[PDB]
Design a protein around this ligand. Structure first.
Ligand SMILES: Cc1cc2nc3c(=O)[nH]c(=O)nc-3n(C[C@H](O)[C@H](O)[C@H](O)COP(=O)(O)OP(=O)(O)OC[C@H]3O[C@@H](n4cnc5c(N)ncnc54)[C@H](O)[C@@H]3O)c2cc1C
Ligand SMILES: Cc1cc2nc3c(=O)[nH]c(=O)nc-3n(C[C@H](O)[C@H](O)[C@H](O)COP(=O)(O)OP(=O)(O)OC[C@H]3O[C@@H](n4cnc5c(N)ncnc54)[C@H](O)[C@@H]3O)c2cc1C
Ligand SMILES: Cc1cc2nc3c(=O)[nH]c(=O)nc-3n(C[C@H](O)[C@H](O)[C@H](O)COP(=O)(O)OP(=O)(O)OC[C@H]3O[C@@H](n4cnc5c(N)ncnc54)[C@H](O)[C@@H]3O)c2cc1C
Ligand SMILES: Cc1cc2nc3c(=O)[nH]c(=O)nc-3n(C[C@H](O)[C@H](O)[C@H](O)COP(=O)(O)OP(=O)(O)OC[C@H]3O[C@@H](n4cnc5c(N)ncnc54)[C@H](O)[C@@H]3O)c2cc1C
Lengths: 347, 342, 346, 341
């Protein structure tokens, strides 16, 4: 007794859901996707990410629980599988006086300490230090492809205009029993879905060779509500990602030079160890610039079943700026919605 | 214990670092300007198809390196699907403008009879070779190095000797292996005047034709070729191509792209649905790399430069993946030789 | 009773901004600064004008505002084509096909050498076809030519970026606060402070620029390749190259040319007017220069030309020209001049 | 009627076409791959600043051409504002870390800076008025001038120079081809000039108007990096430079080089930004890279019978194609006229 599943999409959400589904021997799985790991394109968010684990959800929220559920998997991969491109990094988070002390992730993440009042920079209300992970997305996304392959997942280049078409793309040559929709921001335009609550949150990055040795971030800036500051160093020499930008309803794919300059200035002033004692922006050794669009949904991630044109579909999209840090938690819930959808299909 | 900096993180660098990492007396840093995940004109490896299609003559250095590399690639395609290499049926058509040595090497080798060969075609070979999804394989190689304790660092060097100061131990490296490819033309203390780019333009499509096919030449020009190959694990199909010596142009030419796409659908029509032309190709993107061609082929040899022992492994032209393990095995041999003198 | 002066800032340097600047400059009473983020010679998705074909081929209903602006614009364009070859406009023979899937249009009484194509001559699946002489603008010559025409009349051009329309009033070259600002920011009026026009939307248009000169302009009213895909061609004056189109994708901001869209544009164009290539050739006979994508500044109510007081500054809008900014330019610029003269009456 | 094909539409071709067009016995086709409005690394002209800042020795071919060029540029700036040429105040700083030039006798209000006027680390400095060309207005303006005189323009790619003689708008084989292909003369058939080489120049285009052209003799960032700025006429933007990299063909702007251009420029002339601002004070339009067509012997202006066609070359202008444009064009016309007999 087998189930033909097409996972539509090959970003974090598609790859993590396909991998977890593949652990069930009754699932025969095709990952069908327009863009694959190795691709850089504005329609494909996953490779643009930093990425790190830095919870943004409230303790009792859906997102918060998803973040909480994801950590043990990411820690497991970081501890046991150096081939996956995940490493542990010391992390500092600064919260400005113009604004949260002792967050829930303090009980979860290793080496959590709250910094003393005399250790705080001017303008900072509270700060904390802890161990978390930075994901080298360029190594990790193909690692997930690889893990899916070991469990017999077949990958296939495809483009669909409507979600129900994905059910005709299963490698068996037979109709899929279920389609899992991990199209992210493309679910805004995809037929049978057309989710109007989706919006891009544009994110510009500068990729640099300089290794500061820790992840840094501040709660806000004085450059505007949509210009943020963070940095993280990717595992396995992948480079340092300097950010950033959070521009809702902005679709612009091309790095803006002014914005790039301001990210770099904000970064070298937040964590000066990026550069030598005397230096400004010129001591950064830039690899490239980049821009992705965060698939922000009004109510956050949509993980639910829907019978669409006589095809059972389990959605798993709308992960905004937290798709990696919710990935395993979200994929797990999706695995259960798939089970539930097939259980209704069986009877 | 030997503090080795591998300068470079393309196929040559990664494959050599991996073979070196098998020796526990080696402490290995990979230091490089560009890493897997990067697309840049200075970084050839991501631009490759890539496949195994020998170009060296039987008893040439290149030929023996190609011969030595096959069992490594076969084993990876057989036993490690996570690496992004799979077996593919291959066709090689030879025009007018037979029994090649790889016929005794590659599985399922047959030569085509004249009743099967189209007009203007002299002879053809059919066989099983491999296609490498380089987007998966390059990071896989990073991962295998990582699993063996290899440390990866982002670095830029003006001079080859500087790499000896980038070792992750903090101590001065005993040896630097120069795996900088085409950058060894300008690299301090190497400055190799016999290196030239052979520009290669590609078209990346979603269409899976089920096989690799290539021809010995085209009517579109001396420097224009036809090949296609489908990458493993849904990596896409690579349509080629171009071999343009002393051409450094990083940008895809729209005219060359259309010609690539025209020649490919004519060579192997199963790329497209019956009666479709170029519009039938679902195009992912275009691409351009520069092959690091060297006149005397790959340079693998030891040299004392500014106190630092240097073993070069560069100048692999269009055949860096298909000589990777073979060249890296020679590099290891020369590394042990240079360390014994030390 | 001193020399009467009006300090005007024209905000924007695309066709709307430039044509309106030029018309205002012919009044010696006006002292004019053109302040703009992008200028002729720049390529950017925020700047629609250099992406245009561009031709004259009316889309407005006879008695509609757009239609009347189109009619008013032809004389100016024809005169420039007639008398000023330096401007990069030339006349070209033009054919339009109206398919059976979708007859004596008003421009038949305006444009020279017009004819209805016969019952015998209409190709399969076409209800009506018309041939006529119109104009093709080499935008890469014409936009800088308009800059030059403004400069002759002492218009000062200044690079500037504003978050709010009122800030343009502080950008006048005289050092004094502007009396009026002309808002010609096209699609950027969606986001610009004090304007925030939610009725603006992009209509993405992708082109292929080629070397091949068919010696005529030709379009069709629709295609088999979807509602958002169209077919046209025009050859720019003065060796400017041939523009192959196209695409009309509402609510699509994508700045990058899609290679599949490019191939289909070229396939359709090869079909519609075969003398692009030497017969026996397909797409490979085209000598491609480059690909290009622009976003047409579509407004639901068409072009906004009205006076508004935003903060202390009188503002005259002239934006929302969609895919017809060149063929309405002089018509629209004339109305704005009159609205400016209206607001200055105080 | 002399049927002339001018092969190429950068400064060399356009200026030469315009000069030849003033003789009514010439029927001229400008045939070119790339035309004004295009951006491509095979097309050098739109990547230029451009300004007049002579580099040739007093009695050299180049310096003579620079000298003869000035009055043409001065005149266009004086009487023809529509052409996008700008009079600009100019300062040239010579570092002590790295002399009364001949152009002191050519350019208006030239004066050496006094001892009190020299900044720290500066040996001597020259102040004068020169010209900045808005290449984006001026190139199309030249096309327009050619058009007014009956020059017809044709998009065309040729693999061999002699083929250009078949592209004449009359339909008859051209009496003469003018080779104005710049760096493309290295690969173009019948020419294949191996003394050509690229000198790569990266620029930053900014909105900030400093009010003057600033230039310095050298850098602390290595020989192949330079420092200059110039503001284009008619709101064309300010061009920040730069680099001079022999044999580098690279078309992509390198971000580290860009950052260093911007720092050197705000340090050379701080009125680019406001006091307190660094590189964030610069309002960037875009980055760009062109390849100067450097030739060993400088510009090649001579007749050559290639196949059955008379070819007058005018290429290899390096970083001085604009400031020698008219000088060189005039000589080419003389060479053309002779070749017709
Ligand atoms: C600058 C930036 C930094 C970020 N940093 C972090 C971080 O530090 N931590 C974190 O957790 N998150 C981060 N994110 C967010 C994270 O990148 C996203 O939430 C995540 O990538 C969403 O992945 P996805 O699989 O849902 O969508 P995608 O990555 O967009 O994948 C969608 C898949 O569906 C395919 N597809 C879409 N439509 C079709 C179709 N019609 N037919 C066939 N295939 C289709 C696409 O090709 C693709 O394979 C960041 C995002 C940005 C932009
Ligand atoms: C279109 C195309 C198709 C191809 N197809 C095939 C194929 O089918 N089969 C096949 O076998 N081969 C193929 N090749 C050839 C293959 O890509 C090359 O032979 C191979 O990638 C060269 O590898 P490399 O590691 O030696 O050099 P590279 O891949 O160029 O790596 C060089 C490394 O050195 C680093 N580096 C350089 N300079 C410095 C510096 N100064 N400081 C620090 N680091 C530096 C770079 O950042 C990089 O990490 C193809 C090539 C092209 C262009
Ligand atoms: C592919 C394509 C083909 C077309 N073909 C034709 C055709 O054949 N015929 C025709 O009539 N039309 C055609 N069009 C339409 C035409 O391009 C537009 O209608 C016209 O360009 C709009 O001009 P504009 O000056 O109003 O806007 P723009 O060209 O975008 O000019 C806006 C100006 O405002 C400036 N600006 C904006 N915001 C700010 C700010 N905040 N601060 C400072 N400056 C700012 C911009 O930099 C720019 O200088 C075509 C369009 C496309 C996309
Ligand atoms: C960053 C930078 C700054 C500069 N600043 C200055 C400055 O301040 N002052 C100054 O004087 N100079 C400056 N220069 C130099 C100047 O830009 C060049 O010297 C000049 O533009 C060369 O013009 P050209 O017409 O000879 O060559 P191009 O501009 O390259 O034109 C060559 C023409 O030939 C055509 N062509 C080539 N091959 C073929 C073919 N095979 N078939 C058909 N057509 C062909 C091309 O398409 C083109 O139309 C600068 C250059 C750079 C890169």
């Amino acid at each position: 007794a087998t189930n033909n599943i097409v996972v539509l999409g090959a970003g974090v959400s598609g790859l993590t859901t396909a991998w977890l589904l593949s652990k069930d021997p009754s699932n025969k799985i095709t990952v069908a996707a327009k863009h694959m790991p190795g691709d850089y394109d504005i329609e494909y968010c996953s490779p643009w990410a930093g990425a790190n684990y830095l919870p943004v959800g409230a303790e009792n929220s859906r997102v918060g629980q998803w973040e909480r559920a994801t950590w043990p998997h990411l820690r497991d991969i970081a501890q046991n599988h150096p081939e996956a491109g995940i490493h542990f990094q010391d992390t500092v988070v600064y919260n400005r006086t113009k604004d949260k002390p002792n967050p829930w992730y303090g009980k979860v993440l290793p080496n959590f300490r709250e910094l003393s009042k005399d250790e705080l920079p001017p303008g900072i209300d509270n700060a904390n230090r802890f161990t978390s992970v930075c994901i080298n997305t360029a190594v990790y996304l193909p690692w997930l492809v690889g893990q899916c392959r070991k469990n017999g997942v077949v990958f296939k280049r495809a483009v669909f205009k409507h979600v129900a078409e994905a059910a005709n793309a299963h490698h068996s040559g037979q109709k899929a029993d279920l389609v899992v929709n991990c199209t992210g921001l493309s679910s805004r335009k995809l037929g049978g879905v057309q989710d109007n609550t989706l919006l891009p949150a544009r994110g510009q990055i500068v990729v640099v060779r300089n290794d500061p040795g820790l992840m840094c971030s501040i709660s806000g800036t004085d450059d505007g509500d949509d210009e943020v500051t963070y940095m993280m160093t990717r595992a396995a020499g992948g480079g340092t990602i300097l950010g950033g930008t959070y521009q809702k309803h902005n679709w612009d794919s091309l790095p803006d030079p002014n914005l790039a300059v301001r990210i770099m200035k904000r970064c070298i002033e937040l964590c000066p160890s990026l550069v030598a004692p005397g230096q400004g922006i010129e001591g950064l050794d830039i690899i490239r610039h980049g821009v992705g669009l965060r698939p922000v949904r009004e109510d956050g991630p949509r993980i639910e079943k829907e019978l669409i044109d006589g095809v059972w579909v389990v959605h798993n999209y709308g992960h905004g700026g937290y798709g990696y840090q919710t990935s395993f938690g979200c994929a797990t819930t999706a695995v259960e919605v798939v089970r539930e959808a097939l259980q209704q299909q069986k009877q």
